[PDB]
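Hi W.,

Here's what went into the run:
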Amino acid sequence: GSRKIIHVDMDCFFAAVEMRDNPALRDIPIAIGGSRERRGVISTANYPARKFGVRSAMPTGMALKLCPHLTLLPGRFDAYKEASNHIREIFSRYTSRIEPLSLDEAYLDVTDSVHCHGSATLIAQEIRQTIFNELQLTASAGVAPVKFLAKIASDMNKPNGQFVITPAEVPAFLQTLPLAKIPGVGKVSAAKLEAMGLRTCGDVQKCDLVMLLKRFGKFGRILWERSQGIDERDVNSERLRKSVGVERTMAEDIHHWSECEAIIERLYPELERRLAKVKPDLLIARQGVKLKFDDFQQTTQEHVWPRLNKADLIATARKTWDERRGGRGVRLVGLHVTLLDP
DNA sequence: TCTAGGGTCCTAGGACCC
DNA sequence: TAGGGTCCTAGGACCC
Ligand SMILES: *P([O])(=O)(O[C][C]1O[C](N2[C]=C([C])C(=O)[N]C2=O)[C][C]1[O])OP([O])(=O)OP([O])([O])=O
Ligand SMILES: [Mg+2]
Ligand SMILES: [Mg+2]
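Here's what came out:
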């Protein structure tokens, strides 16, 4: 009953698009991200910038101290969305079992596939080659019997490469696999796991499921299963977006409600436009607001509400501003909508 | 260095129902 | 008849 799962992942996706579209950026350190003045972070960087330590999620002021010649780009999301549509059409030439996880990556289930003599290895190579031939961007891939191993595999021969894990190879692969490599095990969980002596899947194999369930709940079960190589999650091609949000961080903290209302007045048209692309009548389940203060604490209040409404969002922002706030600067204002269930 | 914006999923207490 | 299920809501880890 061994499945064949491919995970395909574009290399340096936004930066790779900006280099294709402007080859002057091919050989200098570049990153997509907000300026230091706009208090931004790096969305991604190309390999010349990564050499300096530039990474996604790094504050832009840190990126520039590492890499003073970093060229900073604002990002062209329609160009990225166009590349995404194109690689997803390429995936559809091989299977309809496609679960996109973001613009630039997807799981493919090729168990029942007829192409390339049923070789998942060869299908993944053909997909990478087609992507390069038709988009002039490179992709990496991972092939494994389950989702999470395929996703780990696609990182191991990046860029422009792939890696295959057979069922025979899974135990040796797991034995020394750090837990932080498992998708869903982040910094906070890895630090709690490390503090109790659990660093690798090998360690977690030496653990009692009951203990893990008590200490971590349902996450304890996922940890126990992943460390065994167990991941029965099916490739699901039917997922749908559940929310849409629009938020902005100010270049300077705001301290007056008039400044906050001004911001919302700019955010609301953007939220209406994006909602209307997917729900023309603007009918929704909930709407709400988000404030983030200068001490980085963040609050949201949302409520049942039938149709996107600018004044109610203003009124709700005003309550949050008056109430849970307390004289701090505000760095971010956001609007949010929960979509009607399908 | 000084910390984004797009999202998904889980948890947990109280309201509400039976 | 003392408790079980199910929304509502806020927060936060985590993902790209
Ligand atoms: P990935 O595959 O992790 O992200 C794809 C693109 O999403 C954007 N993005 C990513 C991260 C991790 C983030 O924190 N913020 C983002 O905005 C930019 C990404 O390009 O990232 P990648 O393709 O760039 O890097 P590699 O080559 O390692 O896959
Ligand atoms: Mg990528
Ligand atoms: Mg990706």
